Subunit: 454 residues, 2 copies
Amino acid sequence: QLLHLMIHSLYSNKEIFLRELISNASDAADKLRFRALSNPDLYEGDGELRVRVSFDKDKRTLTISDNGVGMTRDEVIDHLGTIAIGQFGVGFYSAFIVADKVTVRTRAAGEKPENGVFWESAGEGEYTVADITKEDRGTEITLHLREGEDEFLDDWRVRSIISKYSDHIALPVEIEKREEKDGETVISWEKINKAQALWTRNKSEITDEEYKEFYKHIAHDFNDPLTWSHNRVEGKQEYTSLLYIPSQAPWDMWNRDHKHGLKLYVQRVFIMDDAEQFMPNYLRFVRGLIDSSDLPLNVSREILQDSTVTRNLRNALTKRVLQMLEKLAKDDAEKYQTFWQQFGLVLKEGPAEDFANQEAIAKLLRFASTHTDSSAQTVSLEDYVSRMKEGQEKIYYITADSYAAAKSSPHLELLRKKGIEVLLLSDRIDEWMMNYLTEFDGKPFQSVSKVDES
Amino acid sequence: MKGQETRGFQSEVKQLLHLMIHSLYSNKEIFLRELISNASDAADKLRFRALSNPDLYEGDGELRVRVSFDKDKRTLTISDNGVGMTRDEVIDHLGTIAKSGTIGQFGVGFYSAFIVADKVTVRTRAAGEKPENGVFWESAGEGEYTVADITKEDRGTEITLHLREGEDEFLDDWRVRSIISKYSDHIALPVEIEKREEKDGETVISWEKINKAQALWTRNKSEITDEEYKEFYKHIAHDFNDPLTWSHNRVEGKQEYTSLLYIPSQAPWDMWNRDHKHGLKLYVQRVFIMDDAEQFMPNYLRFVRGLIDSSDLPLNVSREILQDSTVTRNLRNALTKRVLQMLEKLAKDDAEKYQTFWQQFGLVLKEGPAEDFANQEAIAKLLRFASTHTDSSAQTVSLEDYVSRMKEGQEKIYYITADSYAAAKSSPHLELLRKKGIEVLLLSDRIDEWMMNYLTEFDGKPFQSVSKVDES
């Protein structure tokens, strides 16, 4: 039970806990830097945010300490007391793959050090909570390594790993550096981290693993993105965007209770997650961030809804997704087919929602067809067009509930006989979509079906 | 259906779950991969018990797995004709699962399944049993299951998922046909999908193979995709991680066999265990013999996963035999060399992936210079160290690299031994050397010490250290 299912689902990469606590640190710092803008005292001492990693080979413990927003006993109770922010939970329990005891100690931002929180668990089922006095604010996680997990006690190996999960993080990730220097012990801290907000760096110098690690960072997805697009704009609109396209559709995609939007930053200051006013509905699947100069620091989820600057930004961002997608479509056909398998049904509600970009959208669509006796929705409108017979004016299509149903079940033999190709639309939404996508490249569509004799 | 009896209760639940569902939403299409891999295995086991009793095939000797669905009923079936299940194997394996709702992989599959289906039904009959001993099984995957004895002429297992709503992609021909094609390109057992067709009033059913159906290692290197390889690894190693590289080789002549050997991206949680799980997968004349056959690799390479098809071994061969078998010894030696060539290559083609390998297995590989003198030289090149040459603790120093950087007139390879990279770096009395400017390997692994008592020289050059044992 405990063993198997995970030894294969999560234990795959037992380093997972590490690329989470660090991610949590990179977010706790963000929140703090946002509160402290208008409330300097929160920094109460050190304003140089960083996450520190260190180990005690003798005591067998790895520690990760950050000085960000820290937590409240309620915030803690909430994440670790699940059943009789989110990543912290995953990272915590995920740590047990490599640890038999994980201990947390945190004191909140702007709080009496006497209001610190202490939470511990030896894995199993019994935890330990306690109010305590924590001097420096932030969160500190101490792991007690199991036998055989001594790789997290080797300066080299540990350093190396940490790198793999922070080159994309802006928060400095410092590693302890003791050096036996005359008599006493000189304790230093050097940073492994390049420490610059990813979207801030020049595309030229960002590795693919960095873009990929960064996607998993903001989207909270174990999978890699299919493509992305990094763009910096100046002038009319001044902002920086970095948008992704997953490779697997999230479970909450087909729900009224979403998970969509872009991560919003203003003047490099974090504002909120899931700013849904930035992408139209037919692009719910896009993930990414936007860092605007033209938006106030005090923007409201409410403001963006009636915000013109936002609509303008949304329109611009919309076209980038469409370009990204077409570039993918020409650059790597195999991944686009993946895209289409995961999101084709979401993209089909675009012709009725976005007609300024209708042509573009239509080019990204794929269809099943008579041109191959398979149901592979591999056919593109342009392809269809290129194969039309001389004298053919219309793009023919049939609608049904099944590929099968629409294939040899209708009355398309006249067309078959004339050697004309017929799109075989068979998705629940196709019928509705065809009310808005009425012509492509100057050639109008037309269905086959019953009842019609002028 | 006689004797329908419902069985309910057990008592366990927490942490684990939420953690898994998190990863079982990462890919709901996975349950399909499991069932297909399962039928693939429930097929090799039938072929093993085969020759010892050719009557188990009861007619159909063409093993396969059929996938089909019914949109109106919202069902998806994955029936194979492999070995099957005994009422007890059923209750034993399928019971535990149903009890913790809300061998081995036989669970991931059904678990992910329930995420997708609000009901899974399993009609089965183990090979070599009267059609009357057919076992039925079902469960809303809530807390209780139902069992009954049914009659199933057809041997094998017939799993059926009733799809939850919103899970319509699994009733979609195109859609379903891909995933299958995705999780079977690397499988030998044929994977067929139903091809229904109404012929003038009637409805004729046929089955078309979507699968290539060739044993991966039986195909030419050229023809195999880098992806088919990676997926084949996961299938036999049970490791969701891609491997770093591999080595496919078909040897003809004096030694008739084929070998596919991989080098995992990460050390499992049992590398340093006396309850291992280490060994290759043995095949004889293409027929599956056994798993984790540790008699084929030297202990210092226990990290290697892969398989082997011997043409010089009897369809008998047992662990006990391989152990005392000459043919085997010559193979372990042959494979050992191939692993080192592979490793040696990796170091050349991708200094970065090799640095991963080092990181993951460097310490296991350090036992080799003293447990295999015959190859001590090759092994010595593969090792990597943290020298003074760069102000870093990174273990990126080749011993060959070292032979280079050696002020003329120098003939010894110098090294320090410490408990930490820290100690080793300056804690000693290095100065004298630092002055004359000489490269010094900084060793900080517990095993290093043991190793330096046997690793005497490398490139004709002997090793000399800068010792210091200061304890009152």
